[model samples]
Target: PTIGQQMETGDQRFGDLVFRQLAPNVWQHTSYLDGAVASNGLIVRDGGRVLVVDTAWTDDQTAQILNWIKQEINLPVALAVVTHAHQDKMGGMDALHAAGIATYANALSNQLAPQEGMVAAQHSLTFAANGWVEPATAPNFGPLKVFYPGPGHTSDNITVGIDGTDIAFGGCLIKDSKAKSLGNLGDADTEHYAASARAFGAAFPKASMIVMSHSAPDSRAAITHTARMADKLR
Candidate 1:
């Protein structure tokens, strides 16, 4: 059967009908876009070149998003940035790569995904004994330098900073608005978690926006103001 037929059957969805433009170049899909899935994406203008932050899980989902991006921006997504090593975030890499766009991520994330075959199989993506390799390459995407902010929910968890924008993607470090609890510490050191938190807090005060991998963005001042509430729990 054709893809359209398969989608019609609802066995596995490829794309959704609804989409929203969250920011100037950022686009997001919510509420069952291609098999009850949701994901975030961004289209950036750097030196007249366009970059994509992340893509949805499936090919159909990505194709639909890119189609919209194609209409909105004349330039293609020259670069792609994956925040961390996760299937949901990078699942659509193959599709995006096939489009002739250069993709990138934290060196650790890019390299670690392949070493950990179990994680790859579970994520349902291609993997190798050494690491997961993509068709394209990017020496550097932009002013944003990817760095591991210490150990958190995952060893490869990364915090990406966009210099001029002063925006940080603190992969599960800080919660989005309406968040509670410290998140799972499967690959984290609870003892050092607090220190890591404090360190990053001091590291990027100039960054007014913090977009948690698991949540939305919030103001930097909210961290100190909200931590006061954590004192009671400790």
Candidate 2:
């Protein structure tokens, strides 16, 4: 089975994408863009609405994830949480906004999106306090907590926590356990990568399952690998 392959009863497949139940009431969506750049997102149900952790590879794929969750899961998408400014995380913002779906990101993510040669979604809402905004710290959605420990994969990278489940969505900032390298460092803060991961690890010492952006979820090893990459490569 591949990383996103389905196993549970509520698991689903929409076109080339796959979504699986990671925990009770928590779902994960995965798909490939251009047959490469595998991306993952989280679908969390809050009351009668659903909250998306990140969009898929593109707008089309993002729309598919949204539609499937609505028609199959019978819940509307209330919010789309972007973990960073990367395309794999936010490329579907335009489509999401077009559908009247609200999107939120770190203040720096919106500012750095276009600077990184990625399209900025129109009318997307941004939240920042002091400097970095922690969307997950407050209760807008059910158990979601977004944290910015520091910079690793990107200056604006963030981690999402599904509270009560001990699951952390580390986006691209945390590497998969199988990863032998840091993966992509074009926009990484290589100088402070280890510090960033260490901050996150310290922040979420109880996290039992850490989900990376483009790979399978793991325990603390994902954090260990990311810090190791920063130490060995830096």
How does each model score on TM-score? Answer: 0.67, 0.87
Candidate with the greatest TM-score versus the true structure: 2
**CA RMSD of all predictions:** 9.0, 3.2
- Which residue pairs collide, candidate 2? 136-145, 136-146
TM-score of 2: 0.87
CA lDDT of each candidate? 0.52, 0.76
Q: Write the per-residue lDDT of candidate 2 for residues 110-210, one digit (tens) a residue.
A: 78888765555432333354223444433475677767878788888877788788888888888876777787789888888998887778777899988
lDDT per residue (tens digit) for residues 83-163 in model 1: 556654566666776787666665666677675431221121222332223223334466554554554446555455665
Residue 186 in model 2: shift from native, Å? 0.5
* Model 2: per-residue Cα lDDT at residue 51: 85
Strongest candidate by lDDT: 2
Candidate 1: stretches off by over 4 Å:
1-38, 115-140, 221-234
